[PDB]
Amino acid sequence: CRIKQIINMWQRIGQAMYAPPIQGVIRCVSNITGLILTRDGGSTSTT
Amino acid sequence: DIMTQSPATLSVSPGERATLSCRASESVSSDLAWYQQKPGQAPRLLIYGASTRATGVPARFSGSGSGAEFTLTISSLQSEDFAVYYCQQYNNWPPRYTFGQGTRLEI
Amino acid sequence: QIHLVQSGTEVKKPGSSVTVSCKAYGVNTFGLYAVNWVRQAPGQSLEYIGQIWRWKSSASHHFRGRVLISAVDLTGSSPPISSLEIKNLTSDDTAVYFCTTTSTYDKWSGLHHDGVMAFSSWGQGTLISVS
Amino acid sequence: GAVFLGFLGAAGSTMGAASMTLTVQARNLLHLLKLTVWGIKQLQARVLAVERYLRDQQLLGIWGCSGKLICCTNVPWNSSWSNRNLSEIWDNMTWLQWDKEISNYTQIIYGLLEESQN
Amino acid sequence: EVQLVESGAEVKKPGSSVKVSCKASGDTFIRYSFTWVRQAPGQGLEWMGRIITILDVAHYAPHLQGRVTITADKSTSTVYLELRNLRSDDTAVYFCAGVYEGEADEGEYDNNGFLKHWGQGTLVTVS
Amino acid sequence: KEYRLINCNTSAITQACPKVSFEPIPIHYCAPAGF
Amino acid sequence: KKVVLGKKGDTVELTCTASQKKSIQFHWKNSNQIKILGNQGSFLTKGPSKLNDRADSRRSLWDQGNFPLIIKNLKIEDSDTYICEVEDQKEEVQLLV
Ligand SMILES: *[C@@H]1O[C@H](CO)[C@@H](O[C@@H]2O[C@H](CO)[C@@H](O[C@@H]3O[C@H](CO[C@H]4O[C@H](CO[C@H]5O[C@H](CO)[C@@H](O)[C@H](O)[C@@H]5O[C@H]5O[C@H](CO)[C@@H](O)[C@H](O)[C@@H]5O)[C@@H](O)[C@H](O[C@H]5O[C@H](CO)[C@@H](O)[C@H](O)[C@@H]5O)[C@@H]4O)[C@@H](O)[C@H](O[C@H]4O[C@H](CO)[C@@H](O)[C@H](O)[C@@H]4O[C@H]4O[C@H](CO)[C@@H](O)[C@H](O)[C@@H]4O[C@H]4O[C@H](CO)[C@@H](O)[C@H](O)[C@@H]4O)[C@@H]3O)[C@H](O)[C@H]2NC(C)=O)[C@H](O)[C@H]1NC(C)=O
Ligand SMILES: *[C@@H]1O[C@H](CO)[C@@H](O[C@@H]2O[C@H](CO)[C@@H](O[C@@H]3O[C@H](CO)[C@@H](O)[C@H](O[C@H]4O[C@H](CO)[C@@H](O)[C@H](O)[C@@H]4O[C@H]4O[C@H](CO)[C@@H](O)[C@H](O)[C@@H]4O)[C@@H]3O)[C@H](O)[C@H]2NC(C)=O)[C@H](O)[C@H]1NC(C)=O
Ligand SMILES: *[C@@H]1O[C@H](CO)[C@@H](O[C@@H]2O[C@H](CO)[C@@H](O[C@@H]3O[C@H](CO[C@H]4O[C@H](CO)[C@@H](O)[C@H](O)[C@@H]4O)[C@@H](O)[C@H](O[C@H]4O[C@H](CO)[C@@H](O)[C@H](O)[C@@H]4O)[C@@H]3O)[C@H](O)[C@H]2NC(C)=O)[C@H](O)[C@H]1NC(C)=O
Ligand SMILES: *[C@@H]1O[C@H](CO)[C@@H](O)[C@H](O)[C@H]1NC(C)=O
Structure with a gap:
């Protein structure tokens, strides 16, 4: 998992640039409580 | 708005x-x-970030300091270290990266 | 944009069963909509058969025990399918059948009165002859 | 003005049980700069609730029924407005079904209740 | 590590518009933020401006408001400067200078202010 | 206007970047009086 | 329907168009219902097809409703009916190589 800084805005259509990263340890204890999936159409069962 | 050299x-x-x-x-x-x-x-770069050497920098160039006052030391002054020495403040955003004045070392 | 599609013209024997499909293109789900099966004898007026509103299958009092109305939602690779099964056919059920769907989402619509509905969107006709 | 939710507990049940629940649930349900902004926003909630209640009482004030939770007026039913045996009204129907059913007669009833104060 | 071949020296006039290019041949052109710095003869360095290549945004010193334009083209790999309103003090040695900013194509942009790679200096004379 | 080469001036704004803290708190979307 | 022809290699442009100026969600598919493009908010998503690398859209035009598709390196295997799905206007164009 890298850290990237020329981002695409999600607020609108644009790009933003942020400050360089921070001093030390970054902790991100989280919960994955979801997914977002898509599919593939076709074809003539199949998987 | 700001950048003098102490000598x-x-x-x-x-x-x-x-x-x-x-x-x-x-x-x-x-x-x-x-x-x-x-x-x-x-102008050849010597020390960026006031704490580290660039590529091809000899070890006699030792920069240090903190806050606003900084100091570069050259112990073994050779027959090539006579030049003008510049210091550049690149703190602020939006960019107004002013330079220092310069220090001449005619022997 | 409901483009409700039924099966084709069929003919059976008396004292038998039959099944008519109803694929509901453009329908969100049968939880929101409601399917009313109706028929029409040739030349006559439209005769109600049954419904599955809020996943409660129910037929009218003339047709009880003879008619099964089933539904499967929009799952996977197939649109929502309603289906009409008729057991113990007589020669007096030769008719054009219709599945209809109407929206039950808004309470203050006016297209529906507590499960008794106007038929806002229609199929195209499944003729069954009996010989 | 937080008793607007307590009205809704009697939905789904019929009209007589809701009419009893009216009286029952009416009797039973009765210096930093960044903090003065919270005080003003809570007052703008409370005064708005009081003004909405007073507007709802003024719309009952036209019809001679201000303050009364239940009033019985003097406008006789033309019986083409739900020509129905009222046992079936007060036993087989809910209020959502009334707001659906007499929806095309309600402006007429409001006009008659306004005109029968003159 | 681009080599920054500057343009030739020019003879200019008071109240003119000079256009000085700087061909940075070498590594990836969009990964390098560039900087124009002038040098009055005998004097210290004056910072003129800095362009970010991949965002195509250029910032300027407060003394050069409305009279300088730093453009760049990514196919020609060339950083152009255009000065209008040339005055008598504008006879000076100009410098284009770049620095490695990281993988700007996807992620990293370190926003460095120090100038690692330099051009060669070009004297513009206002006569 | 005009008409397919609509003038797409990609503007740019430069503001100051203080490094900020960031941790999302829960939010309760209330409905006003009468709803 | 529309018909747009190409020869080989050069770019080709297909269009959706909405009538709201709102940058709403669209998708570009083909005849076999394989995805080619997808708006996701204000992000771009390609699809698992042969146009995974060669398809593109002008991003700044989405705020004006116009939803283009730009295909580069037109080969012989890119001649099929392409479908806008915007809200309901399932627009069909046919590309010819
Ligand atoms: C969101 O999540 C939701 C859940 O939280 C989910 O909701 C659920 O959706 C699913 C679908 O996805 C629903 O499941 C379907 O339900 C249909 C409706 O079923 C009801 O009614 C039938 C019929 O009942 C009548 O007859 C019986 C006779 O025994 C009487 O007892 C009844 O009172 C009633 O009779 C009255 O009406 C008659 C007319 O119909 C009159 O003649 C009569 O006089 C009376 O007036 C009941 O059988 C159902 O009960 C059964 O299930 C409940 C629990 O669900 C049990 O308690 C109970 O014991 C029974 O098991 C229920 O009342 C069903 O029709 C439908 O069944 C089909 O699929 C199942 C498998 O899923 C098959 O086993 C079944 O055979 C049916 O498949 C046939 O039809 C499909 C196409 O429709 C064909 O593809 C298939 O091949 C098959 O065809 C075969 O049989 C046909 C006739 O049956 C015949 O025509 C064909 O030729 C062929 O032979 C299925 O169960 C589910 O109920 C919802 N549940 C809830 C809680 O909401 C929702 O989908 C999700 N939404 C989204 C968007 O994801
Ligand atoms: C899902 O939810 C969970 C919580 O339920 C979120 O987890 C929290 O994540 C945040 C940030 O990721 C984290 O906050 C940090 O806590 C650390 C431990 O206390 C702090 O040390 C840290 O503060 C430092 O950075 C701040 C930001 O600049 C400074 O303001 C602060 O002074 C601290 O900075 C010191 O050190 C830095 C080092 O770089 C130096 O720059 C500074 O000068 C200074 O010396 C943050 O407060 C929470 O603790 C997490 N909580 C838990 C339980 O883990 C999680 O993020 C959520 N997921 C998502 C995706 O949001
Ligand atoms: C959820 O997403 C699914 C996509 O998977 C959508 O399903 C499509 O829905 C559209 C309508 O919204 C369907 O298009 C219609 O198909 C009708 C029947 O054709 C089918 O059946 C015949 C016979 O078996 C097959 O040969 C054919 O290939 C199809 O399988 C047509 O009759 C309709 O055309 C009519 O209207 C159009 C309008 O443009 C007219 O031009 C025609 O002349 C005609 O009058 C129409 O083409 C489509 O088939 C569905 N596809 C699939 C894969 O399911 C759901 O609509 C969508 N639901 C929601 C709520 O968004
Ligand atoms: C993760 O989920 C558990 C489930 O109980 C919860 O207790 C915990 O607070 C969650 N962690 C967070 C929100 O960081």
Whole structure:
């Protein structure tokens, strides 16, 4: 998992640039409580 | 708005340790760039970030300091360390990256 | 944009069963909509059969025990399918059948009165003859 | 003005049980700069609730029924408005079904209740 | 590590518009933020401006408001400067200078202010 | 206007970047009086 | 329907168009219902097809409703009916190589 800084805005259509990263340890204890999936159409069962 | 160098002229002899320092009006503490310009040459970088050497920098160039005042030391002043020494403050955003004045070292 | 599609013209024997499909293109789900099966004898007026509103299958009092109305939602690779099964056919059920769907989402619509509905969107006709 | 939710507990049940629940649930349900902004926003909630209640009482004030939770007026039903045996009204129907059913007669009833104060 | 071949020296007039290019041949052109810095003869360095290549945004010193334009083209790999309102003090040695900013194509942009790679200096004379 | 080469001036704004803290708190979307 | 022809290699442009100026969600598919493009908010998503690398859209035009598709390196295997799905206007164009 890298850290990237020329981002695409999600607020609108644009790009933003942020400050360089921070001093030390970054902790991100989280919960994955979801997914977002898509599919593939076709074809003539199949998987 | 800000950038004077703490000496003005250093008319010293080789073997003598040099005295180079940079004075700033507001606190920076991480962003000072050191440059060396012989007359007729593009200014070679020495120390960026006031704490580390670039590629091909000899170990006699030792930069240190914090806040607004910084100091570059040259212990073994050779027969090539006579030039103009610049310090560049690159702290602020939006960019107004002013330079220092310069210190000439004619022997 | 409901483009409700039924099966084709069929003919059976008396004393038998039959099944008519109803694929509901453009329908969100049968939880929101409601399917009313109706028929029409040739030349006559439209005769109600049954419904599955809010996943409760129910037929009218003339047709009880003879008619099954089933539904499967929009799952996977197939649109929502309603289906009409008729057991113990007589020669008096030769008719054009229709599945209809109407939206039950808004309470203050006016297309529906507590499960008794106007038929806002229609199929195209499944003729069954009995010989 | 937080008793607007307590009205809704009697939905789904019929009209007589809701009419009893009216009386029952009416009797039973009765210096930093960044903090003055919270005080003003809570007052703008409370005064708005009081003004909405007073507007709802003024719309009952036209019809001679201000303050009364239940009033019985003097406008006789033309019986083409739900020509129905009222046992079936007060036993087989809910209020959502009334707001659906007499929806095309309600402006007429409001006009008659306004005109029968003159 | 681009080599920054500057343009030739020019003879200019008071109240003119000079256009000085700087061909940075070498590594990836969009990964390098560039900087124009002038040098008055005998004097110290004056910072003129800094262009970010991949965002195509250029910032300027407060002394050069409305009279300088730093453009760049990514196919020609060339950083152009255009000065209008040339005055008598504008006779000076100009410098284009770049620095490695990281993988700007996807992620990293370190926003460095120090100038690692330099050009060669070009004297513009206002006569 | 005009008409397919609509003038797409990609503007740019430069503001100051203080490094900020960031941790999302829960939010309760209330409905006003009468809803 | 529309018919747009190409020869080989050069870019080709297909269009959706909405009538709201709102940058709403669209998708570009083909005849076999394989995805080619997808708006996701204000982000771009390609699809698992042969136009995974060669398809593109002008991003700044989405705020004006116009939803283009730009295909580069037109080969012989890119001649099929392409479908806008915007809200309901399932627009069909046919590309010819
Ligand atoms: C969101 O999540 C939701 C859940 O939280 C989910 O909701 C659920 O959706 C699923 C679908 O996805 C629903 O499941 C379907 O339900 C349909 C409706 O079923 C009801 O009614 C039938 C019929 O009942 C009548 O007859 C019986 C006779 O025994 C009487 O007892 C009844 O009272 C009633 O009779 C009255 O009406 C008659 C007319 O119909 C009159 O003649 C009569 O006089 C009376 O007036 C009941 O059988 C159902 O009960 C059964 O299930 C409940 C629990 O669900 C049990 O308690 C109970 O014991 C029974 O098991 C229920 O009342 C069903 O029709 C439908 O069944 C089909 O699929 C199942 C498998 O899923 C098959 O086993 C079944 O055979 C049916 O498949 C046939 O039809 C499909 C196409 O429709 C064909 O593809 C298939 O091949 C098959 O065809 C075969 O049989 C046909 C006739 O049956 C015949 O025509 C064909 O030729 C062929 O032979 C299925 O169960 C589910 O109920 C919802 N549940 C809830 C809680 O909401 C929702 O989908 C999700 N939404 C989204 C968007 O994801
Ligand atoms: C899902 O939810 C969970 C919580 O339920 C979120 O987890 C929290 O994540 C945040 C940030 O990721 C984290 O906050 C940090 O806590 C650390 C431990 O206390 C702090 O040390 C840290 O503060 C430092 O950085 C701040 C930001 O600049 C400074 O303001 C602060 O002074 C601290 O900075 C010191 O050190 C830095 C080092 O770089 C130096 O720059 C500074 O000068 C200074 O010396 C943050 O407060 C929470 O603790 C997490 N909580 C838990 C339980 O883990 C999680 O993020 C959520 N997921 C998502 C995706 O949001
Ligand atoms: C959820 O997403 C699914 C996509 O998977 C959508 O399903 C499509 O829905 C559209 C309508 O919204 C369907 O298009 C219609 O198909 C009708 C029947 O054709 C089918 O059946 C015949 C016979 O078996 C097959 O040969 C054919 O290939 C199809 O399988 C047509 O009759 C309709 O055309 C009519 O209207 C159009 C309008 O443009 C007219 O031009 C025609 O002349 C005609 O009058 C129409 O083409 C489509 O088939 C569905 N596809 C699939 C894969 O399911 C759902 O609509 C969508 N639901 C929601 C709520 O968004
Ligand atoms: C993760 O989920 C558990 C489930 O109980 C919860 O207790 C915990 O607070 C969650 N962690 C977060 C929100 O960081």
